[PDB]
Amino acid sequence: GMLESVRKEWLEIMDRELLEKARSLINANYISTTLSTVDRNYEVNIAVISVLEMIGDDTIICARFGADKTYANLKETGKGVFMVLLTDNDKSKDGIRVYVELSADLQEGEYFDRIKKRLDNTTYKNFPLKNCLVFKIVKILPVSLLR
Amino acid sequence: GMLESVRKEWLEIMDRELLEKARSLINANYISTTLSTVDRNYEVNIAVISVLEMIGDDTIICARFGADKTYANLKETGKGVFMVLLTDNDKSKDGIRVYVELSADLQEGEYFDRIKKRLDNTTYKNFPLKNCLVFKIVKILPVSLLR
Numbered sequence A, B: 001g002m003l004e005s006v007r008k009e010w011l012e013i014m015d016r017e018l019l020e021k022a023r024s025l026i027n028a029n030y031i032s033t034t035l036s037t038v039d040r041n042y043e044v045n046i047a048v049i050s051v052l053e054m055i056g057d058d059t060i061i062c063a064r065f066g067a068d069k070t071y072a073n074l075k076e077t078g079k080g081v082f083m084v085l086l087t088d089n090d091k092s093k094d095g096i097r098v099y100v101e102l103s104a105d106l107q108e109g110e111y112f113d114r115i116k117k118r119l120d121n122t123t124y125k126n127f128p129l130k131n132c133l134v135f136k137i138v139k140i141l142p143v144s145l146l147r
């Protein structure tokens, strides 16, 4: 009994490590960051989405300037997953998967304005910010569980 | 008329370009290759998947040795999207998106034998081949269509 109980302490520690790892990877805004989505007909999509910021422990805000299909999918089904994949293109791989649900679709506010400030310091500064998408974090997994 | 003919020609040249770019990137088997899937409840998953081969213009075969959730999703909905993304020192290099539908899940035959040979020459050589997944290619898009 206490052996299972100790394994749970352990698992909460693992979740905290994964959260902090996710925080650094997401806020780093690597160009190798994607968001996968789906429409009502089960057509899965994936697009590169890097203008991001993780707020607190359960929220990611995202700059939406392109991503037409990705945005449409989120409005229809609401579910998605972010992946930050880092690789040497040789032997090495690292990263994180953050499973998400769209919480808000904003055109103004401090969230809209803060992500707008972040967008202004990027190559896509010249692309009009159409939306600031707010996501709720559902689960964080390592890049690939392999037993 | 003339517009419809020239446009049909443009589409054909474009399609061949997409098929060839996809062929090269898929068959190279980069670490930075993924398969995004979904279940009946619209929950989207993404996993790293590089033991792959594109055959002709309509087929992708893939070794299934890990990827449990990915596999369960494919059996529920059958839909997915592969993405290859090359980035060098956080500089965008190239990539492709290949949209697919599961056609077959096999344990023997030409496809199984083919993907087995490939897997033998990998770090995952010791991982047993549980399935040869056969995909039909449904659409190929460039990485981003941002204007």
Ligand SMILES: Cc1cc2nc3c(=O)[nH]c(=O)nc-3n(C[C@H](O)[C@H](O)[C@H](O)COP(=O)(O)O)c2cc1C
Binding pocket: A093, A143, A144, A145, A146, B030, B031, B032, B045, B046, B047, B048, B049, B050, B051, B052, B062, B063, B064, B065, B066, B067, B068, B069, B070, B071
């Ligand atoms: C570089 C790399 C390539 C991989 N290629 C494959 C593959 O071709 N087929 C497979 O079944 N698993 C492959 N894996 C292992 C899966 O990514 C791993 O089993 C993962 O946990 C599956 O995630 P899932 O449970 O969300 O489906 C690969 C892993 C890495 C790091």
Ligand SMILES: Cc1cc2nc3c(=O)[nH]c(=O)nc-3n(C[C@H](O)[C@H](O)[C@H](O)COP(=O)(O)O)c2cc1C
Binding pocket: A031, A032, A045, A046, A047, A048, A049, A050, A051, A052, A063, A064, A065, A066, A067, A068, A069, A070, A071, B092, B143, B144, B145, B146
């Ligand atoms: C490195 C990189 C980062 C990008 N980041 C974003 C982003 O943060 N938000 C966005 O809307 N589009 C971004 N894009 C553009 C989308 O990927 C592009 O609009 C894509 O075609 C959308 O795909 P979709 O129509 O299937 O949703 C980025 C593109 C690149 C190459």
